[PDB]
RNA sequence: UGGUAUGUUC
RNA sequence: AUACUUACCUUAAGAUAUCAGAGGAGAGUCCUACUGAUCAAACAUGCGCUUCCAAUAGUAGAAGGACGUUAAGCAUUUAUCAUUGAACUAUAAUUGUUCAUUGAAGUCAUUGAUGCAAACUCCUUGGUCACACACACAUACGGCGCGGAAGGCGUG
């Protein structure tokens, strides 16, 4: 594998050979190759002590078509918006005509 | 002009059938489908001089005790390679083709 | 033309889009499930007894068998045998439907509980769970249940719930015993248990 | 022309016209002039016989069949004389007519 | 670029990998790193990159060699290898899992036999395996 | 993108006139290389400038009406 | 007569097997009522690798089955 | 057909200058309205002009690099405008039917009888009577509870959940009509 | 075997516990790579001569 | 541009060659007639076993079951 | 593999006990390169400890 | 096997007989047929598939033959890769008992149609 | 038209079945959606090659002509397709 | 001149 | 259950056994509770017909199996390749021998697989039936009881 390096602190903090490797050996942790200096600079003190809209909720439309699922959400969001607008217009007209009829009677 | 209707006029005829696997089947014809699915009774079948698949197909039909004697065998159409008729039957009277005669009279 | 043998309903010329939609609708599901349950119940409940073969028994077997003893036959009335067979049928069906579920509730605080036992983040059969949700196109089926889902995601780690005894667990269920043989339990316990 | 849109019950006349003036000119010539033909089959069973009938599936009735095959082990030729035969057109590789 | 190259050059993956390799016996770091690697492959199938599948196998092998007493993760990686097509590697993972407890762990025997009820294709071998589970 | 049916795939493959590698039946069969000029509904494909190479020294063949029942796979070389 | 249900294989990588070993892994672009399979970026896999052009069409007579290599 | 070989022969026979009246220009450009409503309940019957795949491939190859034809685009724009005008008339008829159903004679008589009895304590009694009149109006509107689809002009519902609505939006009529609206809006954006 | 995609309830699924998997053995016929008829069929010109 | 039926009606009266599926039977002769099921009728054909000849045949009827291709020389 | 223990014997008792052990046990069908497998497993286990 | 299969019977008359159907391979299926079609697709109840091994084939070539039997249960076999079918074993119940059972099925079906006509009214 | 066996194959959709191919590979899995042409699609597929080995596919789709047989579960032993004298309740005009 | 399936109100 | 909305669809045809003769309908076609012959189906019916139907005057046995045991029975056969390092037989992509680093998949099974052979046990089936524990036969066997299961032939 490229851009990888296998290393374990159990063989590095004990200061043994074979503490790093590039191949898949059982018991080693794979880290990145460019961050091995960041691994060596992290364990410095241990070595020093050793030395010293409300549409498409993705719950209903799961067993549906995966192809046209972008426009289907848009159509649902448009329908919800239209249903909200028709409700708002009805609520506005209900407090306008009846209010005028109350002013007339 | 299908000649399966020629074999439909061949009831109670004591024939042989060589199959595509290689088995020779000696028996009397009872009936034949228009898709040539022919049933036979009083049958003995033999694989001559080999093909181990044909020997397995010969033995695994019950009634072996390599001539195998069986009471009733239906044979599918695509497994029929050729069928040999008895020479005592007259082919000039069984191949009259009355359906073809009616089709020629209808023209 | 197409005819459903289950629902006893006809159809127009045989369209695959109509026939596929017919096997999804709820009436066909109910009729098919009830028919399979009743045919399985009939082939279980059919007591195909052997035809009896009684021969003229030997002489010395008759002088040995008619002199040993005569046993007593027990028998019950109609309502008693009806109630007993109904209790035996409900016991057989509740044993056929039950299963041991101790390993699911016994490894509940395990660090890999969300990767195997959750049955939705499972690898081999989790796509089958995520595929057919029964998407509840009726609004009443979604508005009926008002409880929590408690869907445990796969990303739950060991940092969450560090001490399993502080977060209140459940005491495990006792080993259940047979109610017909419940009168022979030791009535005196070994230790004093409070509450 | 498409096959399904020609006509109804007149396809037999077109089949006879293809029989008289198509690739069936050799099976027609053998059954009216009683010449022997050599049919090579899909399992080395070469048949020298005279044609008695024609079929759409090339199911052929053969009279005075002299058949021959070759067993390769070593090399032997085994023949058989069969009086009447009904050959399926599945097995037929090729049909040769002698002048 | 694929998901593997974006997984290398990502900023969070290096930090999680260094927090794992900094304290190897902190299991929550291992589980966060494993969940991040699985989250990096949101489709899990056989058509993904094998250069990332080898890293997943090395991560699971390092986690199971550092913590061999984890019962559920042998099941997890074994059914992961069963999802990835092969069963011989999954049988090897089950065998090393049962060896990690020395043939006396009920959950691994139960999951291995629920696995073996479909994959053995042999009746006498299933009976010998169930009798081994019976005697152990 | 969209759906491309096999008849329109072979039709675009005919319009573009790419170099063609046509496979056939197994070990008896021989892989042919050429350029497509005509086909039909039973996939009887007509090809030109045909060079045949056996399964792992090619010989020219000319113009060929290859029948349908032996055609296995078509690629653009 | 009936169109086969390959709609779920619309933009996913599949692997056809041909007659005992010829594993052609490609991306399904289209099909017919004859199981003729159009594959983009085909690849022959042997137990080695061989590339099979940009687009290809494969006869349904030699096609036995197909593995969905990509998740659905 | 009963055999697939005749179906493949039909595909070959229908697959194998260009400005001729036999070629359907709405299908030559793409998404003919006589094709998007073939077998549904809103079917127009059969297209009198012929449809072809080779001419469509030639038009795609010409529009890829060669050139474009504005006459077929103008004919498709006129056909889309006529179909959009017919669908807008159908939607206006559906809106007028909904307004007539909301303004029936017995319903308006019951609403006037409820409002005639609707007239501190008097304000609380008037608020309770207005709430009862709103409940009666909601019970009258819930007898049908059918909205109007803003795009396709069909009937919808507000209490219906999003899954049945998503099943409604995935039809031949709605996909075809949304595609025709997208084509009409694209042609009106290109023309204006 | 434990969790299903099936639309049927669990009482149907306990009745639909399927058969055990089939015991595989070694095949007897030739594989489809070797399935063919006979090669090297000689020409019919030898029958027309002798 | 072309189709197999006008190319095959125009292939009549030409020294054509037909290979079979078996790689040991190739018949090269003059084509006479061909139906819609593409049965072949040849005249003065020649057998070709693996390239080498064996003898002339004459008027022959090649079945479309065992053909592999037909070529034009 | 299975570990077997002998403890605290003289020479003749060692001979008699090993012969009585191998007269009752029945071996058979060993794997070919099982020696290298045991070497790798033994080295792996003692490298772990 | 002294069964004496019927001399003028076809597939509509051979139903519910324990067939011993042969295939192209020789993989013999033994079981009761319950349905067929034009392509001879046979469903097989309590079916067993028997073969012979390659080592037993040498002994079979000119005694005991150890066949390999696998159990399929209720299967449905296609009519393409089959060769021949015979009748191996007779069913459990007889022809008169099947006739009484068919009369009971006809009376039950007529009662079900009367129940559908009563529910339709 | 269609016939009893293709209706039985369309009957057991969503059930654990076992196929055998013409090559010798035996599949086993849950049937997704069967067709009249028997081109059947399976899920959670376990496969046995004719060489002997065992593998696992996720979503297979086999063509109907390359199938030796398929095994349905045993509760379809009793099916109304098997009834010989089932009458027909008033087909529509 | 119709069929199948699904969602609301009585 | 009524009332309404939505999603999909709205149909390959022709015919019901064959041959001969007579009559009718404006060479060809149709009909005859028209006539003779063949064939098919159903219901009855008989052929000294063909095959089978398990002791009880014992503690058995016939057919089909065990996806049962002894049985890890006895006799055989296999359990990955490549580069390099320290020697090396050596025409190979160092094949062969001992040890190892690395690289791609990597059936489980070696208590495995094949062949051989005996014993024990258990499952499904029956007329487990009516008289008697008896001296017949070269035209080899009185098939001349009540039935049942499978089949052949013949008649209405």
Closest nt to C11 (CA→C1')?
N3
Give the CA M55 to C1' O107 distance in Å: 8
Chains K and J touch (3+ CB pairs under 8 A): no
Q: Which distant-in-sequence residues (6+ apart) come within 8 Å of L5 by Cβ? A: B41, B71, B72, L86, L87
CA angle A68, A72, A74 (to 5 degrees): 130
Whether the CB of C12 is less than 7 Å away from nucleic strand N comes out as yes
Residues 117-146 of H with CB under 7 A from strand N: 142-143, 145
Cβ proximity of F75 and F52 under 8 Å = no
Cα separation, C109 vs C161, whole angstroms = 8
DSSP one-letter string for chain J: -B-HHHHHHTTSSSEEEEEETTSS-EEEEEEEEE-TT--EEEEEEEEEETTEEEEEEEEEEE-TTSEEEEEE-
Q: G1–H8: do the CB atoms touch at under 8 Å?
A: no
Q: Which distant-in-sequence residues (6+ apart) come within 8 Å of C58 by Cβ? A: none
Quick one: fold of G1-71? SH3 type barrels. (2.30.30)
- For chain B, the residue count is 107
Cβ proximity of F60 and F35 under 8 Å = no
Distance from CA of A37 to the nearest CA of H (A): 54
Architecture of domain M3-81: Roll (2.30)
Residues 117-146 of C with CB under 7 A from strand N: 137-141
Residue of I nearest to E116 (CA): I21
Q: Which distant-in-sequence residues (6+ apart) come within 8 Å of G24 by Cβ? A: F73, G15, G16, G18, G39, G42, G43, G44, G45, G52, G56, G58
Cα separation, I37 vs I24, whole angstroms = 28
Cα separation, H140 vs H47, whole angstroms = 44
Closest nt to C23 (CA→C1')?
N5
Domain ranges of chain G: 1-71
Domain hosting residue F67, numbered range: 3-76
> C35 phi and psi, to 5 degrees?
-70, -40
Give the CA C27 to C1' O11 distance in Å: 26
Residue of C nearest to M75 (CA): C40
Place of tokens 């009471």: B71
Chains H and L touch (3+ CB pairs under 8 A): no
Instruction: Tell me how crowded residue J30 is: count the other CB atoms within 10 A of its CB.
Output: 15
Which residues of chain L does M65 touch, with a Cβ-Cβ cutoff of 8 Å? Answer: 80
Cβ proximity of E117 and E127 under 8 Å = no
Domain hosting residue A39, numbered range: 2-43
Strand order in the sheet with A20-21: A20-21, A5-7, A29-31
Q: Which distant-in-sequence residues (6+ apart) come within 8 Å of J10 by Cβ? A: none
I37 and chain L: CB distance < 8 Å anywhere? no
Cα separation, I5 vs M31, whole angstroms = 11
Query: Strand locations in A15-85, DSSP E?
Result: 20-21, 29-31
Residue of I nearest to G22 (CA): I33
Give the CA L25 to C1' O56 distance in Å: 50
Distance from CA of D19 to the nearest CA of B (A): 11
Q: M28–E85: do the CB atoms touch at under 8 Å?
A: no
Give the CA B52 to C1' O74 distance in Å: 29
Which residues of chain G does E50 touch, with a Cβ-Cβ cutoff of 8 Å? Answer: none
Distance from CA of C117 to the nearest CA of A (A): 22
Instruction: Tell me how crowded residue C152 is: count the other CB atoms within 10 A of its CB.
Output: 15
Architecture of domain L11-87: Roll (2.30)
Tokens of C157: 């780690």
Are β-strands H155-156 and G37-45 bridged in parallel, bridged antiparallel, or unpaired? unpaired
Chain N bases near protein Cβ (<7 Å): 1-9
Cβ proximity of M62 and M11 under 8 Å = no
Cα separation, K38 vs H1, whole angstroms = 68
Which residues of chain C does H160 touch, with a Cβ-Cβ cutoff of 8 Å? Answer: 139
- D–H interface: beta-carbon pairs under 8 A: 7
Tally of domains in chain F: 1
Give the CA K29 to C1' O77 distance in Å: 11
Residue L71, CA distances (Å) to A51, F36, I19, L31 in order: 72, 51, 10, 10
Cβ proximity of H84 and H180 under 8 Å = yes
Cα separation, C34 vs C13, whole angstroms = 28
Give alpha helix (H) positions in chain E.
3-8, 11-22, 27-40, 50-66, 71-83, 88-100, 106-119, 123-135
Cα separation, C56 vs C62, whole angstroms = 10
Instruction: Tell me how crowded residue H173 is: count the other CB atoms within 10 A of its CB.
Output: 17
Q: D96–I41: do the CB atoms touch at under 8 Å?
A: no
* Burial of residue C123, with CB atoms counted within 10 A of its CB: 0-12 exposed, 13-18 middle, 19 or more buried: buried
Chains L and I touch (3+ CB pairs under 8 A): yes
Residues 44-83 of M with CB under 7 A from strand N: none
Give the CA F54 to C1' O96 distance in Å: 36
Largest CA distance in chain K: 39
Mapping DSSP onto H, E and C, the string for chain C reads: CCCCCCCCCCCCCCCHHHHHHHCCCHHHHHHHHHHHHHHHHHHHHCCCCCCCCCCCCCHHHHHHHHHHCCCCCCCCCHHHHHHHHHHHHHHHHHHHHCCCCHHHHHCCCCCCCCCCCCCCCCCCCHHHHHHCCCCCCCHHHHHHCCCCCCCCCCCCCCCCCCCCCCCCCCCCCCCCCCHHHHHHCCCCCCCCCCC
Whether the CB of C20 is less than 7 Å away from nucleic strand N comes out as no
Residue G43 bridge partners (DSSP)? G25, G51
Q: Sort residue H38 into left (φ over 0), alpha (ψ -120 to 50) or beta.
A: alpha
> I48 phi and psi, to 5 degrees?
-75, -15
Of A7, B68, C35, give the one whose Cα is nearest residue L28: B68
Place of tokens 């639909």: I16
* Burial of residue L67, with CB atoms counted within 10 A of its CB: 0-12 exposed, 13-18 middle, 19 or more buried: middle
Instruction: Tell me how crowded residue H107 is: count the other CB atoms within 10 A of its CB.
Output: 15
Cβ proximity of J10 and I26 under 8 Å = no
Q: Which distant-in-sequence residues (6+ apart) come within 8 Å of L72 by Cβ? A: I22, L29, L31, L44, L47, L48, L49, M69, M71
Chains D and J touch (3+ CB pairs under 8 A): yes
Gaps after which residues in chain D, C–N over 2.5 Å? 73
Residue F8, CA distances (Å) to A10, G29, J26, M79 in order: 63, 12, 34, 44
**The CATH number of the domain where F60 resides is what?**
2.30.30.100
Tokens of H23: 């070629």
What does this entry list as its resolution, in Å?
Answer: 4.1
SS3 category, G42: strand
Cα separation, E4 vs M25, whole angstroms = 35
Question: Nearest by CB to E35, which of C116, C124, C157?
Answer: C157
- Any idea what DSSP says for residue H23? B
Q: F11–H5: do the CB atoms touch at under 8 Å?
A: no
Distance from CA of E132 to the nearest CA of A (A): 28
- Any idea what DSSP says for residue D90? T
Experimental technique used to determine this entry: cryo-EM
Of M79, B90, H135, give the one whose Cα is nearest residue C43: M79
Cβ proximity of D65 and D48 under 8 Å = yes
Interface mutation vs chain A, best among C133, C134, C151, most A CBs within 10 Å? C133
Which residues of chain M does L105 touch, with a Cβ-Cβ cutoff of 8 Å? Answer: 83-85
Kindly report the CATH class assigned to J1-72: mainly beta
Cα separation, D77 vs D83, whole angstroms = 20
M2 and chain G: CB distance < 8 Å anywhere? no
Residue G51 bridge partners (DSSP)? G43
Quick one: fold of B1-97? SH3 type barrels. (2.30.30)
Q: Which distant-in-sequence residues (6+ apart) come within 8 Å of C183 by Cβ? A: none
C100 and chain I: CB distance < 8 Å anywhere? no
SS3 category, F68: coil
SS3 category, L51: strand
Residue A78, CA distances (Å) to A75, B7, G25, H84, H153 in order: 5, 71, 41, 19, 13
Give the CA L51 to C1' N6 distance in Å: 51
Cβ proximity of J26 and J2 under 8 Å = no
Cα separation, B14 vs B41, whole angstroms = 10
SS3 category, G69: coil
* Burial of residue E104, with CB atoms counted within 10 A of its CB: 0-12 exposed, 13-18 middle, 19 or more buried: exposed
Cα separation, G64 vs G16, whole angstroms = 8
Place of tokens 């969001």: A77
Whether the CB of H41 is less than 7 Å away from nucleic strand O comes out as yes
Closest nt to H173 (CA→C1')?
O7
Cα separation, I3 vs E28, whole angstroms = 29
Cα separation, M74 vs M68, whole angstroms = 19
Amino acid whose CA is nearest the C1' of O101: A23
Place of tokens 């792992």: F56
Residue A86, CA distances (Å) to A79, A90, H89, H150 in order: 10, 6, 20, 10
C137 and chain H: CB distance < 8 Å anywhere? yes
Q: G32–F5: do the CB atoms touch at under 8 Å?
A: yes
Cα separation, J13 vs J32, whole angstroms = 6
Cα separation, H180 vs H78, whole angstroms = 12
Cα separation, A84 vs A79, whole angstroms = 8
Whether the CB of H40 is less than 7 Å away from nucleic strand O comes out as yes
Are β-strands F20-22 and F31-38 bridged in parallel, bridged antiparallel, or unpaired? antiparallel
Chain E neighbours (≥3 Cβ pairs under 8 A) are A, C, G, I, M
In order of their start, the domains of chain D are: 1-99 (2.30.30.100)
Largest CA distance in chain B: 57
Q: F28–I39: do the CB atoms touch at under 8 Å?
A: yes
Q: Which helix (H) or strand (E) holds B98?
A: helix B98-106
Q: Which helix (H) or strand (E) holds K19?
A: helix K11-22
């Amino acid at each position: 594998m490229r851009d990888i390096v296998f290393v374990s602190p159990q063989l590095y903090l004990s200061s043994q050979e074979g503490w790093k490797s590039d191949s898949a050996k059982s018991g080693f942790i794979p880290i990145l190759k460019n961050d091995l200096q960041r691994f060596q600079d992290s364990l410095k003190h241990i070595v020093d002590a050793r030395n010293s809209s409300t549409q498409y909720k993705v719950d209903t439309n799961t067993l549906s078509d995966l192809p046209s699922d972008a426009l289907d959400q848009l159509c649902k969001d448009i329908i919800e918006f239209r249903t909200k607008v028709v409700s708002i217009e009805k609520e506005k007209k209900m407090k306008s005509t009846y209010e005028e009829s109350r002013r007339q009677r | 002009m299908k000649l399966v209707n020629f074999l439909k006029k061949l009831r109670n005829e004591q024939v042989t059938i060589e199959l595509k696997n290689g088995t020779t089947v000696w028996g009397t014809l009872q009936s034949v489908s228009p898709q040539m699915n022919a049933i036979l009774t009083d049958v003995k079948l033999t694989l001559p001089q080999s093909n181990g698949i044909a020997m397995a197909s010969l033995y695994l039909t019950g009634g072996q005790q390599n001539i195998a004697s069986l009471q009733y065998i239906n044979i599918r159409g695509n497994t029929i390679r050729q069928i040999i008729l008895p020479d005592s039957l007259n082919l000039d009277s069984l191949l009259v083709d009355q359906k073809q005669l009616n089709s020629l009279r209808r023209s | 033309r197409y005819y459903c043998e289950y629902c006893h309903s006809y159809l127009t010329h045989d369209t695959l889009s109509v026939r596929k939609s017919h096997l999804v609708g709820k009436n066909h599901l109910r009729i098919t499930a009830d028919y399979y349950r009743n045919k399985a119940r009939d082939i279980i409940n059919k007591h195909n007894h052997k035809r009896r073969h009684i021969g003229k028994r030997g002489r010395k077997e008759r002088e040995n068998s008619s002199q040993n003893e005569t046993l007593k036959v027990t028998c019950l009335s109609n309502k008693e045998k009806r109630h007993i067979m109904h209790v035996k049928k409900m016991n057989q069906k509740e044993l056929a439907q039950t299963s041991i579920d101790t390993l699911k509730l016994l490894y509940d605080g395990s660090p890999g509980y969300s990767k195997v036992f959750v049955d939705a983040n499972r690898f081999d059969i989790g796509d089958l769970v995520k595929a057919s949700k029964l998407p509840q196109r009726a609004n009443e089926k979604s508005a009926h249940h008002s409880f929590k889902q408690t869907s445990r995601s796969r990303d739950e780690t060991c940092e969450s719930n560090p001490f399993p005894r502080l977060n209140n667990p459940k005491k495990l269920e006792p080993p259940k015993i047979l109610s017909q043989w419940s009168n022979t339990i030791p009535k005196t316990s070994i230790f004093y248990s409070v509450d | 022309r498409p096959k399904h849109e020609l006509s109804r019950a007149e396809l037999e006349e077109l089949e006879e016209f293809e029989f008289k003036h198509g690739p069936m000119s050799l099976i027609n010539d053998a059954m009216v002039t009683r010449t022997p033909v050599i049919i090579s089959l899909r399992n080395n069973h070469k048949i020298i016989a005279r044609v008695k009938a024609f079929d759409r599936h090339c199911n052929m009735v053969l009279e005075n069949v002299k058949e021959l095959w070759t067993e390769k082990k070593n090399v032997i030729n085994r023949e058989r004389f069969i009086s009447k035969l009904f050959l399926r057109g599945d097995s037929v590789i090729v049909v040769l007519k002698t002048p | 670029m694929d998901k593997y190259t974006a997984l290398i050059h990502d900023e969070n993956f290096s930090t999680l990998t260094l927090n794992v390799s900094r304290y190897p016996k902190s299991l929550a770091y291992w589980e966060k790193l494993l969940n991040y690697i699985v989250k990096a492959s949101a489709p899990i199938c056989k058509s993904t990159e094998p250069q990332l599948l080898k890293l997943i196998r090395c991560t699971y092998s390092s986690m199971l060699n550092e913590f061999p007493y984890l019962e559920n993760y042998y099941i997890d990686f074994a059914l992961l290898e069963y999802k990835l097509g092969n069963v011989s590697m999954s049988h090897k993972i089950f065998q090393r899992g049962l060896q990690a407890f020395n043939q006396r762990s009920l959950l691994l025997w139960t999951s291995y036999l629920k696995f073996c009820n479909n994959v053995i294709s042999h009746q006498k071998q299933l009976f010998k395996k169930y009798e081994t589970a019976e005697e152990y | 993108k969209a759906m491309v049916p096999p008849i329109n795939c072979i039709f675009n493959f005919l319009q573009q006139q790419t170099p063609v590698t046509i496979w056939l039946f197994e070990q008896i069969g021989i892989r042919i290389k050429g350029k497509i000029v005509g086909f039909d509904e039973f996939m009887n494909v007509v090809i030109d400038e045909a060079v045949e190479i056996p399964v792992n020294k090619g010989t020219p063949l000319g113009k060929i009406l290859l029948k349908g029942d032996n055609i296995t796979l078509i690629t653009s070389a | 007569v009936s169109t086969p249900e390959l709609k779920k294989y619309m933009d996913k990588k599949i692997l056809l097997n041909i007659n005992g070993s010829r594993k052609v892994a490609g991306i399904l672009r289209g099909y017919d009522i004859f199981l003729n399979v159009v594959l983009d970026d085909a690849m022959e896999i042997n137990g080695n690798n061989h590339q099979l052009g940009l687009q290809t069409v494969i006869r349904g007579n030699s096609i036995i089955s197909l593995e969905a290599l990509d998740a659905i | 057909m009963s055999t697939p070989a005749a179906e493949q022969r039909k595909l070959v026979e229908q697959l194998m200058g260009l400005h001729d009246p036999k070629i359907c220009k709405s299908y030559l450009v793409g998404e003919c309205p006589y094709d998007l409503f073939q077998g549904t309940k809103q079917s127009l019957g059969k297209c009198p002009q012929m449809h072809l795949t080779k001419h469509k491939i030639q038009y795609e190859r010409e529009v890829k690099q060669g050139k474009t034809f504005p006459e077929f685009e103008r004919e498709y724009l006129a056909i889309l405008s006529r179909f959009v005008n017919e669908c807008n008339g159908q939607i206006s008829v559906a809106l007028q039917n909904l307004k007539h159903t909301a303004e029936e004679r017995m319903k308006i008589q019951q609403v006037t009888e409820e409002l005639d009895v609707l007239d501190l304590i008097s304000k609380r009694k008037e608020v309770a009577k207005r709430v009862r009149n709103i409940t009666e109006n909601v019970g009258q509107s819930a007898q049908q509870k059918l909205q109007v689809c803003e795009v396709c002009g069909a009937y919808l519902s507000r209490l219906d959940t999003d899954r049945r609505l998503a099943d409604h939006f995935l039809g031949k009529i709605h996909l075809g009509y949304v595609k025709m609206r997208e084509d009409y809006d694209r042609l009106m954006k290109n023309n204006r | 075997m434990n969790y299903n995609l099936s639309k049927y309830p669990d009482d149907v699924s306990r009745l639909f516990k399927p058969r055990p998997p089939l015991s595989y053995k070694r095949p007897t016929d030739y594989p489809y790579a070797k399935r063919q008829t006979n090669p090297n069929i000689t020409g019919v010109a030898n029958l027309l001569s002798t | 541009p072309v189709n197999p039926k006008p190319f095959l009606k125009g292939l009549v009266n030409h020294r054509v060659g037909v290979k079979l599926k078996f790689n040991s039977t190739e018949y090269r002769g003059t084509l006479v007639s061909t139906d819609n099921y593409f049965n072949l009728q040849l005249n003065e054909a020649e057998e070709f076993v693996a390239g080498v000849s064996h003898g002339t045949l004459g008027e022959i009827f090649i079945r479309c079951n065992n053909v592999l291709y037909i070529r034009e020389l | 593999f299975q570990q077997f223990q002998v403890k605290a014997c003289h020479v003749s008792k060692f001979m008699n006990e090993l012969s009585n052990f191998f007269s009752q046990v029945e071996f058979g069908k060993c794997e070919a390169n099982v020696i290298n497998y045991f070497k790798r497993e033994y080295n792996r286990t003692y490298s772990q400890i | 096997s002294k069964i004496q299969v019927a001399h003028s019977s076809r597939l509509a008359n051979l139903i519910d007989y324990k067939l011993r159907v042969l295939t192209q391979d020789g993989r013999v299926y033994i079981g009761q047929l319950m349905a067929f079609d034009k392509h001879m697709n046979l469903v097989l109840n309590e079916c067993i598939e028997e073969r012979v091994p390659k080592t037993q084939l040498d002994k079979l070539r000119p005694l005991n033959i150890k066949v390999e039997k696998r159990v399929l249960g209720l299967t449905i076999l296609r009519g393409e890769q089959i060769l021949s079918t015979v009748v191996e074993d007779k069913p459990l119940l007889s022809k008169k008992e099947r006739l009484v059972r068919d009369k009971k099925e006809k009376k039950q079906a007529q009662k079900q149609t009367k129940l559908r006509k009563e529910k339709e009214k | 038209m269609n016939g009893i066996p293709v209706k039985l194959l369309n009957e057991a959709q969503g059930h654990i079945v076992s196929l055998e191919l013409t090559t010798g590979a035996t599949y086993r899995g849950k049937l997704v959606e069967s067709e009249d042409s028997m081109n059947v699609q399976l899920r959670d597929v376990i496969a046995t090659e004719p060489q002997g080995a065992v593998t696992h596919m996720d979503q297979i789709f086999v063509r109907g002509s390359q199938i030796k047989f398929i095994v349905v579960p045993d509760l379809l032993k009793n099916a109304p397709l098997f009834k010989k004298n089932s009458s027909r309740p008033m087909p529509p005009i």
